[PDB]
Write an enzyme that holds these catalytic residues in place. Structure first.
Site, PDB file in Angstrom:
ATOM      1  N   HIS A 238       0.837  -1.372   0.057  1.00 48.26           N
ATOM      2  CA  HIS A 238       0.122   0.023  -0.194  1.00 48.26           C
ATOM      3  C   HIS A 238       0.990   1.446  -0.160  1.00 48.26           C
ATOM      4  O   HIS A 238       0.616   1.981  -0.900  1.00 48.26           O
ATOM      5  CB  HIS A 238      -0.938   0.045   1.243  1.00 48.26           C
ATOM      6  CG  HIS A 238      -1.505  -1.404   1.385  1.00 48.26           C
ATOM      7  ND1 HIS A 238      -3.001  -1.630   1.321  1.00 48.26           N
ATOM      8  CD2 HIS A 238      -1.019  -2.503   1.715  1.00 48.26           C
ATOM      9  CE1 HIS A 238      -3.059  -2.759   1.576  1.00 48.26           C
ATOM     10  NE2 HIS A 238      -1.935  -3.362   2.077  1.00 48.26           N
ATOM     11  N   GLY A 239       1.738   1.278   1.042  1.00 47.22           N
ATOM     12  CA  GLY A 239       2.273   2.590   1.225  1.00 47.22           C
ATOM     13  C   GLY A 239       1.762   3.573   2.491  1.00 47.22           C
ATOM     14  O   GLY A 239       2.166   4.454   2.700  1.00 47.22           O
TER      15      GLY A 239
END
Ligand SMILES: CCCCCCCCCCCCCCCCCC(=O)O[C@@H](COC(=O)CCCCCCCCCCCCCCC)COP(=O)(O)OC[C@H](O)CO
Ligand SMILES: CCCCCCCCCCCCCCCC(=O)OC[C@H](COP(=O)(O)OCCN)OC(=O)CCCCCCCCCCCCCCC
Ligand SMILES: CCCCCCCCCCCCCCCC(=O)OC[C@H](COP(=O)(O)OCCN)OC(=O)CCCCCCCCCCCCCCC
Ligand SMILES: CCCCCCCCCCCCCCCC(=O)OC[C@H](COP(=O)(O)OCCN)OC(=O)CCCCCCCCCCCCCCC
Ligand SMILES: CCCCCCCCCCCCCCCC(=O)OC[C@H](COP(=O)(O)OCCN)OC(=O)CCCCCCCCCCCCCCC
Ligand SMILES: CCCCCCCCCCCCCCCC(=O)OC[C@H](COP(=O)(O)OCCN)OC(=O)CCCCCCCCCCCCCCC
Ligand SMILES: CCCCCCCCCCCCCCCC(=O)OC[C@H](COP(=O)(O)OCCN)OC(=O)CCCCCCCCCCCCCCC
Ligand code: HEM
Ligand code: HEM
Ligand code: HEM
Ligand code: HEM
Ligand code: HEM
Ligand SMILES: COc1c(O)c(C)c(C/C=C(\C)CC/C=C(\C)CC/C=C(/C)CC/C=C(\C)CC/C=C(\C)CCC=C(C)C)c(O)c1OC
Ligand SMILES: COc1c(O)c(C)c(C/C=C(\C)CC/C=C(\C)CC/C=C(\C)CC/C=C(\C)CC/C=C(/C)CCC=C(C)C)c(O)c1OC
Ligand code: FES
Lengths: 126, 51, 51, 93, 42, 143, 385, 126, 385
Positions: free
Chosen positions: F109-110
């Protein structure tokens, strides 16, 4: 798949001889009425196969009455065999009733087919 | 072969983590042939100021 | 990590050569046997006015 | 074999299209031709003409979305550079 | 113009030979194509 | 009955229905290093949280979290962080020692997680799972 | 009735391969679909060879894959062909869908074909994930666990269904064995449904780039289109050779090449390139179950795509605004993939949400209204009295 | 699928409104002659889809001359697009030759089918 | 036309399943074919479900079935049903072939059906022999060696093909892996050719017990013959269940449930019961390649029967003594199998040659002379001059 003309030739050879005929005709009759098709009430000119072109050419020339009777006998045989029974001893076909009716059409049609086959591939006649 | 029996003697002596299997490290990281060269060459002997 | 580089490149060179030849061959033959259908011309003559 | 369902197109002889008369075709064998008679003229002039025709609908969305992506990239790079301790705290609220 | 007045096709017509020239060329090329396809399949 | 029998034949068998047990020593774990241990099909975090990190974990505003969860509920020992290595966000374990919150960084995702492992941003309206364990003296049995 | 068409076995081939009335205006986009089918069957046959020379047990799964990589003649070629074939398979599927959508081939004559294709896609993305699971690396089983946790979001039950599907609370031999078996099996359903797809196609025929009737002229497929298929597959095979020999492990990611060890995940974890837009559509919507259902809605919106386009003229070649917005759509799709490739931070989340919004708004709103404007403009401009 | 009667209604609404029509007619004809079908020698009626049964009913009533011309135009368009070429400005459809020859039949068939399906499923309410 | 015949899938289902003008004199013998088809389908399904939890490793093959028996839920059911269904499939297949032979189903309109059936027979000879070779029991290795070394007698090529089959120069992991792969795959080839068989039959139709044309009265397949198929399959399921649940060690032989070890083994090694007819014949003529060529002859005699006899009347029901000789042949078949079960010794070894001679003689010399004699007897009986 066997030609009718050969069978006719063998029959003509054997019947005209007195001793062979007088010795093998009653045994043929008892074989044919112990076969089982006369028991159900079917003429012998209906049991043979109807898929080769010779038969198709043959009964295409059959008269209307014979075709109608053949259809009736065929459907009655189908229904009787489905019912798992036999017809009563009044509506069968006797020895005189099983007259050959499909012979001449086979003879003529198969002779025509044979002459076609043996004339198409004719040679130069050296 | 290897000095460790199967894996036990590795984690005991490394004073930390485990040594990754080098048979596939070439493709185990992004970049490729030059990645390992840069990783083994570009590190200075002294960390950046403030770290 | 990849003990087949020489063999892989040799087989790949042979494969790209043979597929390039086959591709050009298919180009020529497609332009050949479609020539009789890519050039056919149509002419419209209005029919006589009677149903 | 029972007939299949009613469909507009079928087999040869019954395409189903309108009956037409007055159309004349003129084919000729590929053997009596040059198979690559005009490949260069095609691949230059017709290719450039088709590219010019399609040059009014393709590049504009690509350019605008490229600008959007590049602007996002510049914003991301500028955020985490000499602004992460004063600007990045007031954007994550 | 009627149907008998055939439209011009000179743009793609070739030398007035219409003989084994094109036929042999095409047959030889397709023979080579079969060669290459068979070699690759084998 | 036939479909049920076929499904029960396909489903988990006897040997998989047995859960494994493992013990991890907390004496050798470095203060500033992360240790991840696999338990019964999924990993389990073992991190030696710094005293400063404990304050950050227990001083997270509830209004910023979709699921109200405090530090004391998810772990009994404030110093030791023992959590199962699952991410209800998607399922992939966030990268340790990364993220804007100073905690974890979910790699698929981040998105950035806190030092307590709670959900901060994303399509996850549920906090990460909480396992059960017991103490035995100088060690913890994750099971 | 010659021998070719009288014999039923040869008659079946005659109606499909030897003689089939395709139109004469076919571009190089339908042989792309035939190429899709052929690369599919190539994937099937190389999968059969792998299954012949593969072991799925955890104690030997990585051992089996490295043995087929190294300790067998022509082995590594099989793995490289699998990877490149899967990548090209999804690329050509996307091209097939784009050709179908742009040329207006979802209309009334072949709506049934359109739904058949849509469900093919719906289950082939699943089987692609299932094959991705069979690797059993440091990220394959990782994404498998991700998807199991995703499916665990079913309302009103959370534990029984996930335990039944995932073979208990742990992972053992039955889980990976059944996953490999189902990745082996689902492509057979792919083959059967593709058979149905071709049956529907042959019944209803093929469309034209011009978006007009094609019954006026037709040509047999054999001796005219077989060689076009041959040349396009030769080009495809040349490209595949270039990506399998010179640079084999480029389309894939350098993460799968780690022995089975679900202990420490690698720093960079991303889905395969054919799944990034759907990862984006999941990440945008801030809800788990609603995210799953909106992924499924994005996948299934092609089903509701027909009987929504009220443009009287089939296709999009002669309409300018519709094709302009279609190009905007395809570039939005590639932008969604690219943004899903990177990480989630400001300001990527805002423009990703905007991208998903314009995606769904496109489908549900803009094509009807712009098509109505196109039709009314068509009517008004021609009539000047 | 979109009823042609609604198109006619919107068209008559636009055509008799002075300012909006004056704004929208030059862009309309500019869009028509930048569409590109004019160059290929296509009339507009040849482009609208001819599959659903109502269009078939409309086609079946066309006089033979129009059907022949339409078939020729379709064939010529297919041939021209097969070579990716365009014949020069001699086959190009002139500005005022793109008159709808198929609109009245479409409108009549639309009205007939619509009122048929409306009165088929009807109630006896006052 | 109704919508049931309109939709292409529904139209095909109706025309091939729901509606079929079958003849009105059908007995249970014809439903036996559909019963066998259902047995084949259930065999494929249970095999697929068996292989999902199966390991292809050489040392983990017998261990795999052991683990299925002792660990997985209802493990015994799958393998017991598999084995007994295979045996019942083969017995019903012999019954189907015998029914086709006796009723004259090999005539001109069904020669293609006869050919595809005999091809299925040829492949079915080995599709289960190799499946039994897979288990690697105490005569499985012997059966594998027999089948792999039967072909070594071919001149100028005796080592290359056997080396390809061996996956090397002996029996090792490649042998068992290839055995499992082919035993898995080739039933799909059986599926292909049985689809072909049903296609040909549906093109040409069934036959009648009487031997006359059946184009007079017909009834649709649905609601009339579905019930007959249903009762036949119910009876088959009942008997199969009773055997599998109550007497497991009846159809199969207690020889394969022992790990492969060519160290200690008894002399009671004999192949499975369905091999015996085509096994006793191999031990009659005393040579190596002679056995293979006489297997070829014994499998081609089933093919030479068309255009061999001279019976113008289809079938044997209405022939005085030909059915008697057919019964002689079937009892000779049974006795040949039973005497092959016994070991070689006087006079059984002497009985082998005479049994094989009668087995071939019925096929070769008996049928034409008996048919000609029957035809001439009919002709002399029917007419009087
Ligand atoms: C710097 C790159 C060098 C590449 C060298 C290898 C490739 C050589 C290709 C042939 C020599 C170049 C000739 C000039 C360009 C020709 C392009 C063209 O349009 O010509 C024909 C192209 O021939 C083909 O059939 C090409 C099929 C294209 C397949 C789909 C597009 C793929 C990309 C093609 C170009 C790149 C190919 C190599 C990619 C690695 C005509 O098209 P057509 O045969 O379909 O006829 C249509 C009509 O009549 C127009 O006249
Ligand atoms: C379905 C039928 C094919 C349809 C077209 C699809 C083409 C791809 C299908 C095969 C998958 C890839 C296999 C590549 C194996 C390989 O390239 O191996 C390398 C061989 C080397 O042979 P060697 O003796 O030098 O070394 C042998 C010991 N290693 O050279 C080639 O093969 C040349 C490539 C030929 C490509 C196929 C030719 C066109 C199709 C012909 C049939 C139609
Ligand atoms: C010598 C080779 C002869 C090949 C057959 C042929 O070449 O032709 C024989 C016929 C062609 O009949 P036809 O299409 O020429 O009849 C044209 C006018 N009606 O095909 C067949 O029987 C096909 C079936 C062959 C079955 C055996 C095949 C064995 C393959 C191994
Ligand atoms: C396109 C072919 C593959 C190119 C590719 O795969 O290119 C890599 C990029 C991202 O690569 P990356 O930025 O993650 O860096 C990691 C690699 N060094 O994939 C994508 O964006 C794919 C999504 C957009 C393109 C497909 C959308 C339409 C289908
Ligand atoms: C490669 C060689 C393969 C060999 C295959 C051998 C198969 C063995 C079975 C053969 C007979 C069954 C098929 C024909 C059935 C048939 O014909 O039934 C039709 C016939 C009669 O019909 P009907 O109309 O005259 O009834 C009269 C009204 N018209 O009744 C029977 O027979 C009843 C069964 C008699 C006994 C059968 C003997 C075999 C028993 C099974 C084997 C036992 C040992 C094990
Ligand atoms: C599909 C591929 C197989 C087609 C077989 C076929 O098509 O066989 C069709 C022909 C039948 O011809 P028919 O249906 O016109 O006989 C209709 C009237 N009875 O049988 C054969 O040749 C059998 C030849 C002997 C077996 C040779 C097999 C050769 C396979 C190659
Ligand atoms: C009914 C099942 C028959 C199979 C069977 O019963 O298989 C078992 C018997 C084995 O007898 P056995 O003494 O060798 O068993 C020794 C251990 N108790 O096979 C046979 O007798 C085969 C002989 C009949 C073959 C008929 C083939 C045609 C039908
Ligand atoms: C002899 C020279 C060495 C070489 C060429 C070498 C090479 C490497 C490489 C390539 C890596 C992985 C780099 C990457 O992330 O891709 C690595 C990691 C590692 N090495 Fe070495 N190494 C060497 C010496 C050592 C020694 C002496 C030890 C201690 C006994 C050691 C222990 C480790 C450990 C524990 C890791 C993993 C670090 C981590 O998991 O964070 N290495 N080494
Ligand atoms: C069109 C259908 C298929 C697609 C898109 C597909 C896709 C994939 C992908 C992406 C991988 C990962 C391999 C890699 O990353 O190196 C894979 C692996 C694998 N697939 Fe498939 N697959 C398909 C069909 C099949 C079939 C039919 C089989 C039959 C057995 C199969 C067996 C395997 C095996 C054994 C692996 C693991 C081997 C390896 O890792 O090298 N696949 N597949
Ligand atoms: C994945 C396996 C597929 C295969 C083997 C396949 C095969 C084919 C073939 C052979 C055609 C005829 C034209 C051509 O050759 O392209 C076709 C047409 C078509 N396919 Fe597929 N297809 C597949 C998937 C799909 C999917 C997923 C869709 C869903 C969007 C789809 C939608 C269509 C449409 C709309 C057409 C119409 C083209 C024309 O007008 O004839 N197909 N497909
Ligand atoms: C329909 C044709 C088949 C027949 C006649 C057949 C026959 C047999 C037989 C006889 C055995 C045990 C050997 C013995 O006890 O005599 C067996 C075992 C087995 N079969 Fe089949 N089989 C068939 C198809 C299949 C299929 C389609 C599969 C699919 C996976 C399969 C998988 C197995 C497995 C896993 C075993 C366990 C023992 C082994 O490894 O051979 N079989 N089969
Ligand atoms: C073992 C695999 C087989 C399967 C699944 C199968 C399937 C069938 C089916 C469903 C029928 C239709 C029966 C009926 O008309 O009601 C049938 C009929 C027939 N089969 Fe097979 N069959 C097989 C093997 C064979 C074999 C080996 C032969 C001999 C070479 C054969 C020859 C026939 C014949 C002659 C008929 C027509 C029966 C009649 O019309 O009286 N079959 N088969
Ligand atoms: C629209 O116009 C058309 C069109 O109408 C058609 C029909 C086609 C033709 C369609 C195709 C070519 C695609 C069809 C795709 C399939 C049929 C997929 C086939 C799938 C399979 C699984 C093939 C089955 C083959 C096997 C099971 C045999 C493989 C097994 C082997 C080789 C065993 C190997 C082992 C040993 C020991 C040799 C077109 O391409 C086309 O466009 C021009
Ligand atoms: C001509 O007149 C007829 C006639 O019309 C018919 C129909 C029959 C009957 C014929 C048959 C019953 C034979 C047909 C059999 C087949 C076509 C076999 C095809 C089936 C397969 C190849 C396998 C089936 C596949 C599945 C069931 C897929 C589902 C399986 C799995 C493992 C997926 C499920 C798993 C999960 C986890 C959901 C006749 O016998 C007959 O002659 C009288
Ligand atoms: S998976 Fe947890 S933040 Fe993305």
């Amino acid at each position: 798949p066997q030609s009718f003309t050969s069978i006719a030739r063998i029959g003509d050879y054997i019947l005209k001889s007195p001793v062979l005929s007088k010795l093998c005709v009653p045994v043929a009759n008892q074989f044919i009425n112990l076969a089982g098709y006369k028991k159900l009430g079917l003429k012998f000119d209906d049991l043979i196969a109807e898929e080769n072109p010779i038969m198709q050419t043959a009964l295409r020339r059959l008269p209307e009455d014979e075709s109608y009777a053949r259809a009736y006998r065929i459907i009655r045989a189908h229904q009787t065999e489905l019912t798992h029974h036999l017809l009563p001893r009044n509506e069968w076909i006797k020895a005189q009733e099983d007259v050959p009716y499909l012979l001449p059409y086979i003879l003529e049609a198969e002779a025509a087919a044979k002459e076609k086959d043996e004339l198409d591939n004719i040679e130069v006649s050296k | 072969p290897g000095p460790y029996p199967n894996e036990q003697a590795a984690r005991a002596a490394n004073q930390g983590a485990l040594p990754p299997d080098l048979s596939l490290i070439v493709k185990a990281r992004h970049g490729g042939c030059d990645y390992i060269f840069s990783l083994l060459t570009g590190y200075p002997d002294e960390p950046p100021a403030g770290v | 990590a990849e003990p087949e580089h020489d063999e892989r490149k040799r087989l790949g060179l042979k494969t790209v050569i043979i597929l390039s030849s086959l591709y050009l061959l298919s180009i020529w033959v497609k332009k050949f046997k479609w020539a009789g259908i890519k050039t056919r011309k149509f002419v419209f003559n209005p029919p006589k006015p009677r149903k | 074999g029972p007939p299949s369902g009613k469909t507009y197109m079928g087999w040869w002889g019954h395409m189903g299209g309108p009956k037409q008369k007055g159309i004349t075709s003129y084919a000729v064998s590929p053997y009596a031709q040059k198979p690559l008679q005009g490949i260069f003229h095609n691949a230059v002039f017709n290719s450039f003409r088709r590219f010019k025709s399609q040059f009014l609908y393709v590049l504009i969305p690509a350019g605008i979305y490229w600008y959007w992506w590049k602007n996002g990239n510049e914003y991301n790079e500028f955020l985490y550079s000499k602004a992460g301790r004063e600007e990045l705290e007031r954007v994550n609220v | 113009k009627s149907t008998y007045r055939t439209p011009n096709f000179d743009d793609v017509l070739k030398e007035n030979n219409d003989a084994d020239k094109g036929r042999s060329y095409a047959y030889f090329m397709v023979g080579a194509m079969g060669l290459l396809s068979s070699a690759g399949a084998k | 009955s036939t479909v049920e029998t076929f499904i029960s034949s396909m489903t988990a068998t006897a040997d998989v229905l047995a859960m494994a047990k493992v013990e991890v020593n907390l004496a050798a774990i470095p203060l500033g290093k992360n240790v991840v241990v696999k338990w019964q099909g999924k990993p389990v975090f073992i991190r030696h949280r710094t005293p400063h990190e404990i304050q950050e974990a227990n001083s997270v505003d509830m209004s910023a979290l979709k699921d109200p969860q405090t530090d004391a509920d998810r772990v009994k020992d404030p110093q030791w962080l023992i959590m199962l290595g699952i991410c209800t966000h998607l399922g992939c374990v966030p990268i340790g020692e990364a993220g804007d919150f100073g905690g974890w960084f979910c790699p698929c995702h981040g998105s950035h997680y806190d030092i307590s492992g709670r959900i901060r941003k994303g399509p996850a309206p549920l906090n990460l799972e909480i396992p059960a364990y017991e103490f035995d003296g100088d060690k913890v049995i994750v099971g | 009735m010659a021998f070719r068409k009288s014999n039923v076995y040869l008659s079946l081939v005659n109606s499909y391969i030897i003689d089939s009335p395709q139109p004469s205006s076919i571009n190089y986009w339908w042989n792309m679909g035939s190429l899709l089918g052929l690369c599919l069957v190539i994937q099937i046959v190389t999968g059969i060879f792998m299954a012949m020379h593969y072991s799925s047990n955890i104690e030997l799964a990585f051992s089996s894959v490295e043995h087929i990589m190294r300790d067998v003649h022509n082995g590594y070629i099989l793995r490289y062909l699998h990877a490149n074939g899967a990548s090209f398979f999804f690329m050509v599927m996307f091209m097939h869908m784009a050709k179908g959508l742009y040329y207006g081939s979802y209309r009334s004559p072949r709506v049934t074909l359109w739904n058949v294709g849509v469900i093919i896609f719906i289950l082939t993305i699943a089987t692609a994930f299932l094959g991705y699971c069979c690797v059993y690396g440091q990220m394959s089983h990782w994404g498998a666990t991700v998807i199991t946790n995703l499916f665990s979001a079913i309302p009103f039950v959370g534990n029984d269904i996930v335990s039944w599907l995932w073979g208990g609370f742990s992972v053992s031999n039955p889980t990976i064995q059944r996953f490999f078996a189902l990745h082996y099996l689902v492509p057979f359903i792919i083959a059967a449904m593709v058979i149905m797809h071709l049956m529907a196609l042959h019944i209803h025929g093929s469309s034209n780039p011009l978006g007009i009737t094609g019954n006026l002229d037709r040509i047999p497929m054999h001796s005219y289109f077989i060689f076009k298929d041959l040349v396009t597959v030769f080009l495809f095979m040349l490209i595949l050779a270039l990506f399998v020999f010179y640079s084999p492990n480029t389309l894939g990611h350098p993460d799968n090449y780690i022995p089975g060890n679900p202990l420490v995940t690698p720093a960079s974890i991303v889905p395969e390139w054919y799944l990034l837009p759907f990862y984006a559509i999941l990440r945008s919507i801030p809800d788990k179950l609603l995210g799953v259902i909106t992924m499924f809605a994005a996948i299934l919106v092609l089903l509701v795509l027909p009987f929504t386009d009220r443009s009287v003229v089939r296709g999009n070649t002669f309409k300018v605004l519709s094709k302009f917005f279609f190009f905007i759509f395809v570039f939005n799709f590639v932008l969604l993939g690219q943004i899903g490739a990177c990480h989630v931070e400001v300001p990527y989340v805002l423009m990703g949400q905007i991208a998903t919004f314009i995606y769904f708004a496109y489908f549900l709103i803009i094509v009807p209204v712009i098509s109505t404007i196109e039709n009314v403009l068509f009517y008004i401009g021609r009539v000047n009295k």
